[PDB]
Amino acid sequence: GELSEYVEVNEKGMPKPQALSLWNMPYAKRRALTKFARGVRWQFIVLFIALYNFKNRDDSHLLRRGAYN
Amino acid sequence: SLAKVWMYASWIPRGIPKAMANELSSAAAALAHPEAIARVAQLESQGKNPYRVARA
Amino acid sequence: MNWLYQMIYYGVRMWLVFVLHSFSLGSFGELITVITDNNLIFNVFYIGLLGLGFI
Amino acid sequence: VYTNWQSSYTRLFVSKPWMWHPLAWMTLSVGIWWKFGKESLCNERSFYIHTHPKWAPHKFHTVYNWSRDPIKWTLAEQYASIIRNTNTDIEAVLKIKLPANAN
Amino acid sequence: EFWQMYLACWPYRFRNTVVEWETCKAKVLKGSVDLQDIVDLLYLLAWAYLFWILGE
Amino acid sequence: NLRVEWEKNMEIQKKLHPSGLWSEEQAFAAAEKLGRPKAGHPMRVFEDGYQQFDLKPKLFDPD
Amino acid sequence: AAPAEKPDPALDATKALPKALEEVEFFQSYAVRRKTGFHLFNRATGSPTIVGPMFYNLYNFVRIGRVSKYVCWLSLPLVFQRMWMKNRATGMEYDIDLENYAPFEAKKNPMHGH
Amino acid sequence: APLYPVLSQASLYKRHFFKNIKLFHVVFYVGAPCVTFGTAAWSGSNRNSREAIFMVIEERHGWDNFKKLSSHQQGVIMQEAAQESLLARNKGELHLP
Amino acid sequence: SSYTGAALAPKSERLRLAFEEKQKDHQKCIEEAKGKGLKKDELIDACAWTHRKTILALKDWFAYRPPFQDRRSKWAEYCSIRHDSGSWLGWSQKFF
Ligand SMILES: CCCCCCCCCCCCO[C@@H]1O[C@H](CO)[C@@H](O[C@H]2O[C@H](CO)[C@@H](O)[C@H](O)[C@H]2O)[C@H](O)[C@H]1O
Ligand SMILES: COCCOCCOCCOc1ccc(C(C)(C)CC(C)(C)C)cc1
Ligand SMILES: COCCOCCOCCOc1ccc(C(C)(C)CC(C)(C)C)cc1
Ligand SMILES: COCCOCCOCCOc1ccc(C(C)(C)CC(C)(C)C)cc1
Ligand SMILES: COCCOCCOCCOc1ccc(C(C)(C)CC(C)(C)C)cc1
Ligand SMILES: COCCOCCOCCOc1ccc(C(C)(C)CC(C)(C)C)cc1
Ligand SMILES: COCCOCCOCCOc1ccc(C(C)(C)CC(C)(C)C)cc1
């Protein structure tokens, strides 16, 4: 089994742990971790790559025109 | 012995035509009419060469 | 997507199989013909007319 | 007794996806050629790649004969036929002086 | 008829090649070689020389 | 053996091209002898649509 | 989910190998031959060959054909054509100038491209 | 009193000749001429020896001059070219790339 | 050595120089055909190749419009990205 975006539930309405249990920590810590998490992983990686390439973008075509003189 | 040496020396020469020879023999046994084969056996029993007889 | 991957993979596999096996077989045949053409004692139907072909 | 098998090919085609499959196959193959193989291989600007020994080995049963250049003279005959049908002046193109996108 | 006998005669010929070879060997070693044997061997050598030229 | 010996003896003294290789000097001399055109380089790599699928193309440069 | 289907014998594999062996047995049944006119050159050891004793079957099947047994031999003269032309070419005398100017399938000929 | 266009016995006898074919009756009967006179044996040998022959000719003699010669000398040079190609002295006598 | 970088001349200048080169290659064919003493109908069969090459270079030059200056193109230049300032939808404008 171990399907994607799938999770089983026990009698208490709680998710059963497939690999790792993280329901021992208090609600405050979980809310701190998950308040900023989303249902998206690779888009943030592509965005960080784009931001790195934007910080490191080339501006020679502006140098040729004289915008840095 | 010397006979074994001659065998292992003449194996490769002796066996080059054996395939075609066996092929022709078997194709004769198959395609040829059995009456002709029986006549060949008869003539060979009579001491004659049936190939020369056929040619004649 | 893995359906597409498997389709491409097995198409390429069949192509490679046919091409490479035909080429290898023909290459061995041509090498044998080179060995026998230079040695006409062997340039004979040494296995047989139908035996090799049937096999 | 009525059957589309013997009385209507259209309703038979509509009622059977396994009759739609070959048509979709055909359309997809032609679209693939149109998008990818058309301009890269079949266009006159992209037809000399058939002379390449790596990407088109023995498309002419041999290595391409460049001293002969069959492509050049075939297409030149055809362009000449176009020019004669259109009655265009050969030397009119040489009287042109294109400007430059200054600044 | 000749085609059928030509086919049917191939086994006889391939069988008697070895027989004639062994008898020739025995006659040459024993020395019991006669006039008809000499004539047959000369005919043999003539045809063999012709086929030697042909193979050349 | 006769053929290959003659061919080797001619390859050694440069009267014949080596096995599998087109030699320039012998070909030019044979062209001068037969009065034929010399072997040129008729290919055109910079023709439209020849090295488009080439990852490492060749650059045009008037020498 | 829990359909409880009984085993289907048609989905088993207990007939393919028997059927193939039946076909092979039908093939080998045509290898039966009479003692008269039998000859097979064995190896120098005296042991039989492989292809030798399985030529009668093949040619007994060739006997039963209708078109191939009269057509498939017409490609065989071509073998002797090659046998003869190869020997003609092994020692053919040629002009040195044309071989140096126009060598056949030689490498580094710019007129070819490389 | 059949209301349909009853087909004669002889017409069925003739159609049976056409629809009583088996697979092998097509496969082998059409494969024998095909395998013999096909891209493998005869047509292939002919049409692929021609390419090498005329390559050799146009490299050595020229196609126009070859066209100007007689059919006999044409055949002579063609046979010489066929021998040169079958030999493949430059490929180490091997018809491989 | 070598380097993967920007084109030397602009697209407009590149196409212009290509057309001029094909103009030269066509003029040479025409002058040679005139030296050989060919008529118009023979000159066509001679230099139709270079004529078509010149015409294709001219087509390339005419098809390419150099870009117009505006705020979006300048912002893309600052961002150093290939951007069309005539599209409200991007890749989907092809279908709308
Ligand atoms: C926890 C503290 C850690 C301390 C270490 C911090 C290190 C942070 C990384 C600094 C590295 C900056 O890396 C450097 O960035 C500059 C821009 O900033 C890039 O430069 C880029 O921007 C310039 C600015 O116009 C362009 O002209 C240029 O063409 C382009 O390459 C360099 O190619 C890269 O080498
Ligand atoms: C073209 O034909 C020329 C034939 O030449 C034959 C030469 O003569 C050879 C005769 O040699 C022999 C050998 C043996 C014998 C013996 C001793 C065995 C006697 C015999 C034949 C009466 C049994 C006789 C003659
Ligand atoms: C098994 O042995 C059978 C007989 O073998 C005898 C071999 O004799 C050697 C003959 O040598 C030659 C070689 C060539 C020739 C030529 C080329 C002169 C013959 C010719 C002109 C008829 C072709 C003649 C004799
Ligand atoms: C190791 O390989 C084992 C794989 O086994 C393959 C089994 O397939 C056998 C197929 O061969 C045939 C062909 C025809 C037939 C019959 C006789 C049933 C054909 C028919 C219907 C014309 C009578 C039966 C078996
Ligand atoms: C469609 O499936 C049929 C394919 O079957 C092909 C079988 O090919 C093998 C037949 O070849 C042989 C092998 C051995 C034999 C005989 C030599 C059985 C052995 C014998 C006669 C000495 C007992 C005959 C023919
Ligand atoms: C290799 O073969 C190529 C040519 O073969 C031609 C075979 O033609 C045979 C035609 O078969 C017949 C024979 C008779 C008939 C008729 C109608 C005359 C028979 C009849 C009168 C009994 C109904 C019809 C078809
Ligand atoms: C190892 O197997 C080798 C044998 O393969 C030979 C390939 O033969 C090609 C097709 O041969 C046929 C011909 C007819 C048939 C039958 C007789 C079953 C055809 C049918 C179903 C129409 C009666 C089956 C196969």
Side-chain angles (χ1 to χ4, degrees), chain D residues 25-37:
Chain D
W25 198 342
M26 293 145 56
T27 307
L28 272 167
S29 73
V30 175
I32 287 154
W33 172 79
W34 199 268
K35 174 55 175 76
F36 299 92

PDB file of all heavy atoms in Angstrom, chain D residues 25-37:
ATOM      1  N   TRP D  25      -5.402   7.869 -33.304  1.00  0.00           N
ATOM      2  CA  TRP D  25      -4.022   7.503 -33.602  1.00  0.00           C
ATOM      3  C   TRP D  25      -3.507   8.259 -34.818  1.00  0.00           C
ATOM      4  O   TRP D  25      -2.414   8.838 -34.796  1.00  0.00           O
ATOM      5  CB  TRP D  25      -3.963   5.999 -33.840  1.00  0.00           C
ATOM      6  CG  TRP D  25      -2.634   5.372 -33.757  1.00  0.00           C
ATOM      7  CD1 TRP D  25      -1.423   5.982 -33.826  1.00  0.00           C
ATOM      8  CD2 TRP D  25      -2.377   3.982 -33.599  1.00  0.00           C
ATOM      9  NE1 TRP D  25      -0.423   5.057 -33.717  1.00  0.00           N
ATOM     10  CE2 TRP D  25      -0.985   3.817 -33.574  1.00  0.00           C
ATOM     11  CE3 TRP D  25      -3.191   2.859 -33.472  1.00  0.00           C
ATOM     12  CZ2 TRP D  25      -0.392   2.578 -33.427  1.00  0.00           C
ATOM     13  CZ3 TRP D  25      -2.600   1.632 -33.320  1.00  0.00           C
ATOM     14  CH2 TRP D  25      -1.214   1.497 -33.304  1.00  0.00           C
ATOM     15  N   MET D  26      -4.284   8.240 -35.897  1.00  0.00           N
ATOM     16  CA  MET D  26      -3.900   8.914 -37.128  1.00  0.00           C
ATOM     17  C   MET D  26      -3.732  10.410 -36.905  1.00  0.00           C
ATOM     18  O   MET D  26      -2.729  11.010 -37.318  1.00  0.00           O
ATOM     19  CB  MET D  26      -4.960   8.643 -38.189  1.00  0.00           C
ATOM     20  CG  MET D  26      -5.018   7.196 -38.637  1.00  0.00           C
ATOM     21  SD  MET D  26      -6.670   6.612 -39.040  1.00  0.00           S
ATOM     22  CE  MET D  26      -7.133   7.801 -40.282  1.00  0.00           C
ATOM     23  N   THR D  27      -4.716  11.029 -36.252  1.00  0.00           N
ATOM     24  CA  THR D  27      -4.656  12.461 -35.990  1.00  0.00           C
ATOM     25  C   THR D  27      -3.444  12.815 -35.143  1.00  0.00           C
ATOM     26  O   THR D  27      -2.769  13.816 -35.400  1.00  0.00           O
ATOM     27  CB  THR D  27      -5.943  12.914 -35.304  1.00  0.00           C
ATOM     28  OG1 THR D  27      -7.073  12.491 -36.072  1.00  0.00           O
ATOM     29  CG2 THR D  27      -5.973  14.417 -35.156  1.00  0.00           C
ATOM     30  N   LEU D  28      -3.137  11.991 -34.143  1.00  0.00           N
ATOM     31  CA  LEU D  28      -2.012  12.283 -33.264  1.00  0.00           C
ATOM     32  C   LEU D  28      -0.690  12.140 -33.994  1.00  0.00           C
ATOM     33  O   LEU D  28       0.220  12.951 -33.798  1.00  0.00           O
ATOM     34  CB  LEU D  28      -2.041  11.360 -32.052  1.00  0.00           C
ATOM     35  CG  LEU D  28      -2.856  11.838 -30.857  1.00  0.00           C
ATOM     36  CD1 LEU D  28      -3.038  10.700 -29.887  1.00  0.00           C
ATOM     37  CD2 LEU D  28      -2.188  13.014 -30.178  1.00  0.00           C
ATOM     38  N   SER D  29      -0.555  11.112 -34.829  1.00  0.00           N
ATOM     39  CA  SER D  29       0.673  10.950 -35.597  1.00  0.00           C
ATOM     40  C   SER D  29       0.882  12.122 -36.547  1.00  0.00           C
ATOM     41  O   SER D  29       1.998  12.649 -36.669  1.00  0.00           O
ATOM     42  CB  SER D  29       0.631   9.632 -36.362  1.00  0.00           C
ATOM     43  OG  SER D  29      -0.259   9.705 -37.456  1.00  0.00           O
ATOM     44  N   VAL D  30      -0.185  12.559 -37.216  1.00  0.00           N
ATOM     45  CA  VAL D  30      -0.052  13.675 -38.143  1.00  0.00           C
ATOM     46  C   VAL D  30       0.263  14.962 -37.389  1.00  0.00           C
ATOM     47  O   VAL D  30       1.048  15.791 -37.858  1.00  0.00           O
ATOM     48  CB  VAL D  30      -1.316  13.812 -39.006  1.00  0.00           C
ATOM     49  CG1 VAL D  30      -1.223  15.038 -39.878  1.00  0.00           C
ATOM     50  CG2 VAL D  30      -1.498  12.590 -39.875  1.00  0.00           C
ATOM     51  N   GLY D  31      -0.327  15.145 -36.208  1.00  0.00           N
ATOM     52  CA  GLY D  31       0.006  16.304 -35.399  1.00  0.00           C
ATOM     53  C   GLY D  31       1.446  16.283 -34.925  1.00  0.00           C
ATOM     54  O   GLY D  31       2.102  17.324 -34.853  1.00  0.00           O
ATOM     55  N   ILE D  32       1.955  15.096 -34.603  1.00  0.00           N
ATOM     56  CA  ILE D  32       3.347  14.959 -34.193  1.00  0.00           C
ATOM     57  C   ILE D  32       4.268  15.370 -35.332  1.00  0.00           C
ATOM     58  O   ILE D  32       5.238  16.113 -35.134  1.00  0.00           O
ATOM     59  CB  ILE D  32       3.625  13.518 -33.729  1.00  0.00           C
ATOM     60  CG1 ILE D  32       2.988  13.273 -32.364  1.00  0.00           C
ATOM     61  CG2 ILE D  32       5.108  13.244 -33.647  1.00  0.00           C
ATOM     62  CD1 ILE D  32       2.657  11.835 -32.097  1.00  0.00           C
ATOM     63  N   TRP D  33       3.980  14.891 -36.542  1.00  0.00           N
ATOM     64  CA  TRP D  33       4.795  15.284 -37.688  1.00  0.00           C
ATOM     65  C   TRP D  33       4.693  16.780 -37.949  1.00  0.00           C
ATOM     66  O   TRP D  33       5.693  17.434 -38.261  1.00  0.00           O
ATOM     67  CB  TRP D  33       4.383  14.505 -38.931  1.00  0.00           C
ATOM     68  CG  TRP D  33       5.057  14.995 -40.161  1.00  0.00           C
ATOM     69  CD1 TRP D  33       6.329  14.726 -40.556  1.00  0.00           C
ATOM     70  CD2 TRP D  33       4.501  15.855 -41.158  1.00  0.00           C
ATOM     71  NE1 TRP D  33       6.603  15.362 -41.738  1.00  0.00           N
ATOM     72  CE2 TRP D  33       5.495  16.064 -42.129  1.00  0.00           C
ATOM     73  CE3 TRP D  33       3.260  16.470 -41.321  1.00  0.00           C
ATOM     74  CZ2 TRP D  33       5.284  16.858 -43.248  1.00  0.00           C
ATOM     75  CZ3 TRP D  33       3.054  17.256 -42.431  1.00  0.00           C
ATOM     76  CH2 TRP D  33       4.059  17.444 -43.381  1.00  0.00           C
ATOM     77  N   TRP D  34       3.489  17.338 -37.824  1.00  0.00           N
ATOM     78  CA  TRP D  34       3.289  18.760 -38.068  1.00  0.00           C
ATOM     79  C   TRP D  34       4.077  19.610 -37.084  1.00  0.00           C
ATOM     80  O   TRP D  34       4.656  20.634 -37.462  1.00  0.00           O
ATOM     81  CB  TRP D  34       1.802  19.083 -37.974  1.00  0.00           C
ATOM     82  CG  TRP D  34       1.413  20.356 -38.621  1.00  0.00           C
ATOM     83  CD1 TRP D  34       1.339  21.581 -38.036  1.00  0.00           C
ATOM     84  CD2 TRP D  34       1.030  20.538 -39.984  1.00  0.00           C
ATOM     85  NE1 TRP D  34       0.936  22.517 -38.950  1.00  0.00           N
ATOM     86  CE2 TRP D  34       0.739  21.900 -40.156  1.00  0.00           C
ATOM     87  CE3 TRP D  34       0.905  19.679 -41.078  1.00  0.00           C
ATOM     88  CZ2 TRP D  34       0.336  22.426 -41.375  1.00  0.00           C
ATOM     89  CZ3 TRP D  34       0.506  20.202 -42.285  1.00  0.00           C
ATOM     90  CH2 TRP D  34       0.222  21.562 -42.424  1.00  0.00           C
ATOM     91  N   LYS D  35       4.108  19.204 -35.816  1.00  0.00           N
ATOM     92  CA  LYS D  35       4.749  20.018 -34.793  1.00  0.00           C
ATOM     93  C   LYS D  35       6.261  19.842 -34.796  1.00  0.00           C
ATOM     94  O   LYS D  35       6.996  20.820 -34.616  1.00  0.00           O
ATOM     95  CB  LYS D  35       4.167  19.669 -33.422  1.00  0.00           C
ATOM     96  CG  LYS D  35       4.838  20.336 -32.216  1.00  0.00           C
ATOM     97  CD  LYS D  35       4.880  21.849 -32.334  1.00  0.00           C
ATOM     98  CE  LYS D  35       5.427  22.484 -31.072  1.00  0.00           C
ATOM     99  NZ  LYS D  35       6.900  22.339 -30.978  1.00  0.00           N
ATOM    100  N   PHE D  36       6.743  18.619 -35.009  1.00  0.00           N
ATOM    101  CA  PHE D  36       8.147  18.282 -34.808  1.00  0.00           C
ATOM    102  C   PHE D  36       8.892  17.976 -36.098  1.00  0.00           C
ATOM    103  O   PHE D  36       9.975  18.522 -36.327  1.00  0.00           O
ATOM    104  CB  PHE D  36       8.246  17.088 -33.854  1.00  0.00           C
ATOM    105  CG  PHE D  36       7.665  17.355 -32.499  1.00  0.00           C
ATOM    106  CD1 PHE D  36       6.345  17.051 -32.226  1.00  0.00           C
ATOM    107  CD2 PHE D  36       8.434  17.924 -31.503  1.00  0.00           C
ATOM    108  CE1 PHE D  36       5.806  17.301 -30.984  1.00  0.00           C
ATOM    109  CE2 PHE D  36       7.900  18.175 -30.258  1.00  0.00           C
ATOM    110  CZ  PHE D  36       6.584  17.864 -29.999  1.00  0.00           C
ATOM    111  N   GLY D  37       8.341  17.120 -36.950  1.00  0.00           N
ATOM    112  CA  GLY D  37       9.067  16.633 -38.107  1.00  0.00           C
ATOM    113  C   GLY D  37       8.927  17.479 -39.354  1.00  0.00           C
ATOM    114  O   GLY D  37       9.735  17.364 -40.279  1.00  0.00           O
TER     115      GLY D  37
END
